[PDB]
């Protein structure tokens, strides 16, 4: 989960 959150931050 949190890895996907960071992924989402860095994609933005």
């Amino acid at each position, epitope marked *: *989960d*949190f*890895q996907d959150e960071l992924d989402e*931050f860095f994609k933005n």
Partner: antibody, heavy 118, light 110 residues
Framework: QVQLVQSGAEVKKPGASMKVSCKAS????????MHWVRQAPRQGLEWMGL????????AYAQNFQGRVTLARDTSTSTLYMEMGSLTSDDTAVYYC???????????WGQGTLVTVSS | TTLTQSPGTLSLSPGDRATLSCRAS???????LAWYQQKPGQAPRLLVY???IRATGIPDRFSARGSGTDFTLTISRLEPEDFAVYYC???????????FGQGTKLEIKR
């Protein structure tokens, strides 16, 4: 059999820059966010920054923004941290840490003593 | 968000039940709180994170709980190797930020 093998201890003069490294083995390096944490003598843990698995994205602690650079080398499975304008307050053990998907650090390097002193 | 741990030093006997407290400056979710153990001269070791999810190979005597600003790590029966320093850690993703409590020393009562 996760291995995070950090570069050796460093001594630095104030105002110098340092580059510390952490070589990963035993796991798929490019699947993991990697983090740097430091611990000054008899003090607590302090986050410095993270770098995403591709190496394209980093995020630094506000107290280190500007003076810290994170890089990773997919070819050597090696995490790097560079930190500039060192003062004696940066004397600390520097740890690389592998982030589990939960966001916690499931595996740590053995640490790198960086001594900053005139 | 800063984390403040209490007490600074907890003195217990092996076999006791230890509760270590982590206090966040503002409300956080337990899922973004992790607990680490560090023995002197060693790197920290993740114990428990989130709603009492124990790290791989962490025995069942380690648990964590809490809500709002109040979180706890419990060691239900202290082993000699459990006397160490314990750090809580909080993380957020937007923007990516990590922070640690200042550490609680778990000392042998005598």
């Amino acid at each position: 059999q996760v291995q995070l093998v950090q570069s050796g201890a460093e001594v630095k003069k104030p105002g110098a820059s340092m580059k510390v490294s952490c070589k990963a083995s035993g796991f798929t390096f490019t699947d993991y966010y990697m983090h740097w944490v430091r611990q000054a003598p008899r003090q607590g843990l302090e986050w410095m920054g993270l770098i995403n698995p591709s190496g394209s994205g980093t995020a630094y602690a506000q107290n280190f923004q500007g003076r810290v650079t994170l890089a990773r080398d997919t070819s050597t499975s090696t995490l790097y941290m560079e930190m500039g304008s060192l003062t004696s307050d940066d004397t600390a053990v520097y740890y690389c840490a592998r982030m589990d998907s939960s966001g916690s650090y499931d595996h740590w390097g053995q640490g790198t003593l960086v001594t900053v002193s005139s | 968000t800063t984390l403040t741990q209490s007490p600074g030093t907890l003195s217990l006997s092996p076999g006791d039940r230890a509760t270590l407290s982590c206090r966040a400056s503002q409300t956080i979710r337990i899922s973004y709180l992790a607990w680490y153990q560090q023995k002197p001269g060693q790197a920290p070791r993740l114990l428990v994170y989130g709603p009492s999810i124990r790290a791989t190979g962490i025995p069942d005597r380690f648990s964590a709980r809490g809500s709002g600003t109040d979180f706890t790590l419990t060691i239900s029966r202290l082993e000699p190797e459990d006397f160490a320093v314990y750090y809580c850690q909080h993380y957020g993703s937007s923007p990516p930020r990590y922070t640690f409590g200042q550490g609680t020393k778990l000392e042998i009562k005598r």
